[PDB]
């Protein structure tokens, strides 16, 4: 005989009551309140008490799962499954003398023990079962796991007001490559404020607590912090807030201090991280609203406050790194920066090999040609290129549907109608192509003078200073157009094996560059960050404006002066 399943009423919610008809109670031979074990259709089982329906009609079953197998709360009845009667059993309940529970508490020992006695008072329970607290219950225990008992609750049993309750305990995604170089630069900072049970209170200070991530829009900045997240616990209150303000002056400064209040509340025995995103915050035509960045300043001040109290790490991600507040950048709230650049030719192949691994693409597909043809893209557009080449190989297809053959015909078809991302052709580009010294014909004496003033002072620094020779603090090369000045600088960077920050004048003509005093300060800071380095300013007459003229000269003249191997050469 088959019985239907119906959703429970508002009076059976959290009462552990099973509503049966009279013929099923005659067939089971049960009294009122006797224990019925229900073997569920989608695995697992539950334990309930038998109570009759008011209507007297037979053919229907309702059930409320409170004592359940873990992950077996499948008693929702949208599809209206039917249960057979062979799945309900009448189970004898001896009384118990000792239980063993493991509690799951909400976000001392005596209050937890008192809340366990109060939940489990006069109930039938079995072994390996979760007892779930009803909604609106007083106290702090959210769940209990049943571990053991001395009259052995394997065919279950009844807790009594005079039983004993004891506490034991035994509870038995895209990897994204290409950011490997910067993923561990993050850990050499943030691992030391994750192994802190007030040990750095005892011996030390506090490495910074205020990091900043920058990069082009599409290199996967938000997914990197979720990867460093899971990597070391943490609940990442990822407060984005692109428009959290309003018409009132600073009405969300009360709101962000409650955001910052639960940074402390969720700081006991566990890591936490405040993840401010899109600190972009557009540029209003008129003066930005006071509350907009004042609270920032509050966030600033608040942040600088986090130093006199319990110290919570803040990782911020912005898109365009310049035109921030200059009172951030000073030692404190925000002084350690990790820069994620546009991808090179090398790991763009390993960007592609991560995405190619999940899809069934056949072995007759190039990678180096797919890396080389895709110059100008970011990591978001390479996923959509591999999304679109899956679609035109499902779009057009055959009738067999057993061999997923994706070939080079529809990768080149999907290359055609995907537009490339902007905000790449700017700032400064390292890595270009290797040029040897033998490609430049003639000019033997100019090669000797360039070697004696920039490569010998950056490669052999002890023998330069012991012989008593000065380092020239910035050279200038001038001549007619067409006599290999840019080739001689690029041959010098290959033999030096150093970083190469190059700014040209044709980079500066783009309208996406914001006013270029702070692009010129961004170039000097990325240089002093990367160590032994060559800063190349090609076409300085276009940079200096052959007003904004006098302001540019000034940011340049002040940086040219204020500056075991160091120093930045300016060519």
């Amino acid at each position: 005989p088959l019985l239907k399943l119906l959703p429970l009423d508002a009076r059976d919610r959290g009462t552990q009551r099973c509503r049966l008809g009279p013929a099923a109670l005659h067939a089971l031979g049960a009294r009122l309140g006797s224990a019925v074990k229900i073997s569920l259709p989608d695995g697992g089982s539950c334990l309930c008490t038998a109570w009759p329906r008011r209507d007297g009609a037979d053919g229907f079953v309702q059930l409320d799962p409170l004592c359940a197998s873990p992950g077996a709360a499948v008693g929702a009845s949208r599809s209206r499954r039917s249960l057979s009667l062979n799945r309900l059993l009448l189970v004898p309940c001896p009384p118990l003398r000792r239980v063993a529970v493991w509690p799951v508490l909400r976000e001392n020992t005596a209050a937890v023990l008192e809340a366990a006695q109060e939940l489990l008072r006069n109930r039938p329970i079995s072994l390996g079962h979760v007892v779930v607290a009803p909604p609106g219950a007083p106290g702090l225990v959210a769940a209990l796991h049943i571990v053991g008992g001395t009259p052995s609750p394997d065919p279950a049993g009844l807790v009594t007001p005079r039983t004993r309750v004891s506490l034991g305990g035994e509870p038995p995604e895209v990897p994204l490559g290409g950011l490997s170089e910067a993923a561990d630069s993050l850990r050499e900072l943030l691992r030391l404020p994750l192994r802190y049970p007030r040990a750095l209170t005892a011996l030390g200070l506090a490495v910074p607590r205020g990091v900043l991530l920058a990069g082009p829009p599409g290199v996967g900045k938000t997914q990197l912090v979720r990867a460093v997240a899971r990597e070391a616990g943490a609940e990442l209150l990822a407060v984005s807030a692109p428009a959290l303000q309003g018409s009132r002056p600073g009405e969300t400064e009360e709101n962000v201090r409650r955001v910052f209040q639960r940074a402390r509340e969720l700081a006991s025995r566990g890591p936490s991280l405040l993840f401010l995103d899109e600190m972009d915050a557009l540029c209003p035509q008129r003066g930005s609203r006071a509350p907009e960045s004042r609270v920032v300043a509050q966030v600033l001040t608040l942040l600088d406050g986090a130093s006199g109290d319990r110290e919570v790490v803040v990782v911020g991600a912005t898109n365009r790194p310049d035109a921030l507040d200059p009172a951030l950048r000073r030692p404190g709230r925000f002084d350690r920066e990790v820069v994620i650049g546009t991808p090179t030719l090398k790991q763009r192949k390993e960007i592609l090999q991560v995405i190619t691994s999940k899809m069934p693409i056949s072995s007759h597909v190039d990678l180096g040609l797919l890396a080389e043809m895709t110059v100008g893209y970011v990591g978001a557009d390479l996923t959509a290129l591999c999304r679109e080449a899956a679609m035109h190989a499902l779009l057009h297809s055959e009738k067999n549907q057993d061999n997923p053959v994706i070939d080079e015909i529809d990768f080149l078809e999907a290359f055609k109608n995907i537009q490339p991302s902007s905000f790449r052709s700017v700032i400064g580009l390292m890595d270009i192509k290797p040029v040897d010294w033998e490609e430049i014909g003639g000019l033997e004496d100019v090669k000797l003078k360039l070697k004696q003033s920039i490569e010998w002072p950056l490669k052999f620094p002890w023998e330069f200073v012991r012989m008593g020779l000065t380092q020239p603090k910035g050279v200038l090369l001038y001549g007619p157009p067409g006599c290999a000045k840019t080739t001689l600088v690029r041959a010098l960077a290959t033999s030096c094996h150093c970083s190469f920050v190059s700014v040209s004048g044709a980079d500066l003509f783009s309208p996406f560059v914001g006013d270029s005093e702070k692009v010129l300060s961004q170039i000097f800071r990325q240089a002093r960050a990367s160590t032994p380095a060559i800063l190349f300013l090609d076409e300085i007459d276009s940079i200096l404006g052959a007003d904004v003229q006098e302001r540019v000269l000034s940011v340049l003249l002040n940086e040219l002066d204020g500056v075991f191997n160091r120093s930045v050469m300016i060519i």
């Binding site: 239907k4 119906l6 959703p7 209206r80």
Partner: peptide, 26 residues
């Protein structure tokens, strides 16, 4: 059906009831 929403009387006419066992009326 009759309900008084803050003094205003409402007249409701029931056209169709669909219940928990899936059987509808006319």
């Amino acid at each position: 059906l009759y309900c008084t929403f803050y003094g205003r009387p409402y007249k409701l006419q029931v056209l169709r009831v669909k219940g928990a066992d899936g059987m509808i009326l006319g």
